[PDB]
């Protein structure tokens, strides 16, 4: 099978900035992956991303109805929608599990299971941390609504000095702390 | 609550 | 602070369309185009809301008479294929005899076809496992996951292989220990 | 705007009738709402995109078609006594919550026995001389009568040209026999003028009733002339006394 | 499901009256409600609409206010006109989708305010070309209510307002006929209450 494939899109984003405070709305389609037509909330109409977008920004802004519907799309369909999921996606907050092992002139910790993604993990060397010698593997979406972070740390584990991994998330009031 | 569509608009022929 | 995103697709000539609702990056919902219901990506989001899966019926519709529209102004340029990138992980630490999930990471892909199967020892598994539905991304791609629930062995020896149109063979990503 | 054909459509039980619509809006959804004399507006079909949406309406009876987003047709196989209502066809931007915006409507009359449709009986009755020296103005009656269906447009024409001011027509007609079921109706209209504009004998005045009935291809085999759309009048120039 | 209720039954009002067209519904969804009206020989139109809870819509002196707490659509105007004469449907429709339920419309009917009546039954003619003779009932104030015929050979029509125009005059008319002989125009309105000043002439 090697016939060829057409691909059309459509993506009609939100995008909140402290809440339902300010709002933006773009209506996007898109031919395979080039944008061709976009209603900006901030424009006030259909406007053409590409040539291939003309025909249907001034044939959508002619007709009657649409620029009233589009405009007051930040109310009618932005901020609607975030209240309906607001209890389970904005206010979302699971707590995460935090392992720590060796793997031995690295030390690890491990981060898993936790939402929303924002999250902040130092390293302790003893009552100070250890700022040289990190090397995080970056936020890692798990694709279900649970994020992980490893952080290592390039330090040379000798008997005697406690290491404390200390993470902080919005899931908590206070920060986690594990010590080896 | 009840979620809401976007309706996607027919292109120009 | 948040993007929500309604995301809809229709591919031809494979004449497949998907619709689902993005939020910061995971999956709320998403439109089962045979059976016409809502499927939740998490099983409590269904009791909190709800959807009205005819609607979305309509769009896919809609994007489908669009798809042949716009095909013609285009004077029929098709779609570049572009290979994925695979990735193989584990959402825990993984411990001897302590159940955990393998995901296989499907990124930076189109168009929106895949032929993914989990290999045990060089076998394939269909017990347990998962799967999404195609996610959108800011470059207009796609990303899917891939869960097989396993229990470690030492062993057992794990594979995702996946088949798309930008590769030639399939790629194979490996998983031991 | 919306277009709908035909205005009025008289027809027999079991028979075939289609209904056209076209909205110039640029709108992608239209819709068949059926409206009855008790004044009840419900939904039969709605289309969107050549897509349909909504069906409310009795399984297997109709048969809408859109070969086109601004094109919406129905179709009804064999019509039953209980479709004799106004059919409106109306158009909205997309299947959201929307406005709807309306055509004109068909009305549409489903007889058993296409025997009982008569063409109206058109006479003009002259301003009474009483009225004239007491009120110093003149109003004429035109009764249109013996009509079935109530598919009529009555208007006044004075010397060729069309007039509205001072014209009152029934909103409703009366059954002549309103204990039968297929009574024929009777209407009346005024046309009230001036005394003087009456007295003037240069002046014409005539009364046009445009009835809606069958159609030349339609079969009638009676002794009477076939009761097909046509148009009866009656006429009466003015009186210097 | 969704329903609507509205007045029912046709509202007849003297022209300047305060209109009030009572609307309740009952839906499971967030609905934005619509106001429609139909003139006579058109189809409905929209006369205001309100997407949000407690906000008020107004158009042509109409206003109604959107009360989620009462699920009430009242529509209100504090001085009709005769030209308000229409039906008015009061309509729902769940703000995810276009399900739009109309209620049992509402006729409204304006009567005008008579200044100088003059009531008065005449009798007209014809080339009698129709074995029928005409009484006309005109210029009375719309208090009078034509009551229709008993008698099966004798048709009576209702009252009907015209308007001369140039002259800024209204006035009030029905007409009543019939073929046989023993009609006569001064008994032609007995099944109706009007004025004792009514003007018979001597035909
Ligand atoms: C967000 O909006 C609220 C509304 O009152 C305001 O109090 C707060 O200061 C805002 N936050 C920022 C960061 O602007
Ligand atoms: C499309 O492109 C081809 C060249 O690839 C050209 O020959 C043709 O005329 C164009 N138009 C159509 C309708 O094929
Ligand atoms: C998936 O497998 C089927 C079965 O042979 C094949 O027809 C299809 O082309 C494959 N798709 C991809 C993307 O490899």
């Known amino acids: 099978d090697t016939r060829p494939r057409f691909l059309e899109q459509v993506k009609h984003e939100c995008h909140f900035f402290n809440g339902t405070e300010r709002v933006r709305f773009l209506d996007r389609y898109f031919y395979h992956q080039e944008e061709y037509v976009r209603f900006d909330s901030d424009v006030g109409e259909y406007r053409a991303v590409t040539e291939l977008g003309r025909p249907d920004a001034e044939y959508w802004n002619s007709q009657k109805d649409l620029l009233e519907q589009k405009r007051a799309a930040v109310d009618t369909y932005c901020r609607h929608n975030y209240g309906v999921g607001e209890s389970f996606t904005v206010q979302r907050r699971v707590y995460p599990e935090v392992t720590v092992y060796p793997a031995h002139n690295l030390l690890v910790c491990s981060v898993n299971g936790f939402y929303p993604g924002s999250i902040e993990v130092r390293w302790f060397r003893n009552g100070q941390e250890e700022k040289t010698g990190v090397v995080s593997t970056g936020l890692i979406q798990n694709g279900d609504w649970t994020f992980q972070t490893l952080v290592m740390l390039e330090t040379v584990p000798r008997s005697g000095e406690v290491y404390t991994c200390q993470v902080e998330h919005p899931s908590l009031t206070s920060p986690l702390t594990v010590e080896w | ?13 | 602070e948040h993007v929500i995103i309604q995301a809809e697709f229709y591919l031809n000539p494979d004449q497949s369309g998907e619709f689902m609702f993005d939020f910061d990056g995971d999956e709320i919902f998403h439109v089962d185009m045979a059976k016409k219901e809502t499927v939740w990506r998490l099983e409590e989001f269904g009791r909190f809301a709800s959807f009205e899966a005819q609607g979305a019926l309509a769009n896919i519709a809609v994007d489908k008479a669009n798809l042949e529209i716009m095909t013609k102004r285009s004077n029929y340029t098709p779609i570049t294929n572009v290979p994925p990138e695979v990735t193989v992980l584990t959402n825990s630490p993984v411990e001897l005899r302590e159940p955990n999930v393998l995901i296989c990471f499907i990124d930076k892909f189109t168009p929106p076809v895949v032929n993914v199967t989990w290999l045990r020892n060089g076998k394939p598994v269909t017990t347990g496992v998962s799967e999404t539905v195609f996610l959108p991304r800011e470059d207009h791609l796609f990303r899917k996951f891939h869960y097989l629930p396993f229990l470690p062995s030492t062993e057992d020896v794990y594979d995702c292989r996946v088949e798309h149109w930008g590769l030639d063979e399939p790629l194979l990503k490996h998983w031991e220990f | 705007a919306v277009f709908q054909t035909p205005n009025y459509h008289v027809t027999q039980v079991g028979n075939e009738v289609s209904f056209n619509c076209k909205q110039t809006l640029g709108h992608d959804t239209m819709y068949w709402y059926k409206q009855d004399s008790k004044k009840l507006l419900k939904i039969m079909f709605s289309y969107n995109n050549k897509q349909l949406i909504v069906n409310e309406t009795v399984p297997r009876r109709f048969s809408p078609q859109s070969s086109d987003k601004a094109h919406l047709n129905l179709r009804i196989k064999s019509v039953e006594p209980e479709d004799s209502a106004v059919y409106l066809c109306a158009s909205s931007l997309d299947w959201g919550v929307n406005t709807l915006y309306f055509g004109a409507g068909t009305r549409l009359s489903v007889l058993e026995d296409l025997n009982k449709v008569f063409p109206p009986e058109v006479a003009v009755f002259e301003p009474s001389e009483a009225e004239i020296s007491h009120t110093q103005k003149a109003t004429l009656v035109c009764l249109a009568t013996g009509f079935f269906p109530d598919h009529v447009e009555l208007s006044w024409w004075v010397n060729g040209k069309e007039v509205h001011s001072g014209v009152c027509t029934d909103p409703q007609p009366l059954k002549e026999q309103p204990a039968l079921n297929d009574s024929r109706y009777a209407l009346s209209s005024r046309l009230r003028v001036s005394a003087t504009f009456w007295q003037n004998p240069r002046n014409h005045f005539r009364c046009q009733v445009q009835f809606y009935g069958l159609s030349e291809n339609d079969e009638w085999t009676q002794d009477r002339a076939k009761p097909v759309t046509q148009i009866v009048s009656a006429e009466a120039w003015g009186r210097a006394d | 499901g969704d329903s609507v209720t509205q007045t029912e039954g046709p509202v007849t009002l003297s022209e300047g009256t305060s209109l009030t067209v009572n609307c309740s519904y009952e839906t499971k969804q967030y609905p934005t409600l619509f106001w429609y009206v139909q003139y006579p020989g058109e189809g409905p139109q929209l006369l205001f609409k309100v997407p949000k809870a407690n906000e008020k819509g107004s158009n042509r002196g109409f206003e109604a206010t959107y009360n989620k707490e009462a699920t009430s659509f009242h529509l209100q105007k504090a001085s009709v006109q005769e030209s308000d004469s229409a039906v008015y449907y009061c309509a729902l429709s769940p703000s995810n989708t276009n399900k739009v339920v109309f209620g049992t419309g509402t006729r409204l009917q304006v009567l005008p305010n008579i200044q100088n009546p003059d009531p008065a039954v005449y009798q007209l003619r014809d080339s009698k070309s129709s074995d029928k003779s005409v009484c006309l009932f005109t210029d009375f104030d719309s208090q009078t209510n034509v009551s229709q015929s008993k008698d099966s050979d004798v048709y009576i029509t209702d009252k009907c307002v015209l308007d001369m125009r140039s002259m800024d005059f209204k006035s009030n008319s029905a007409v009543a006929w019939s073929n046989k002989s023993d009609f006569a125009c001064a008994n032609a309105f007995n099944n109706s209450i009007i004025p004792e000043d009514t003007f018979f002439p001597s035909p």
């Open chain 2, 1 to 13: 609550g009840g979620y809401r569509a976007r309706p996607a608009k027919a292109a120009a022929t």
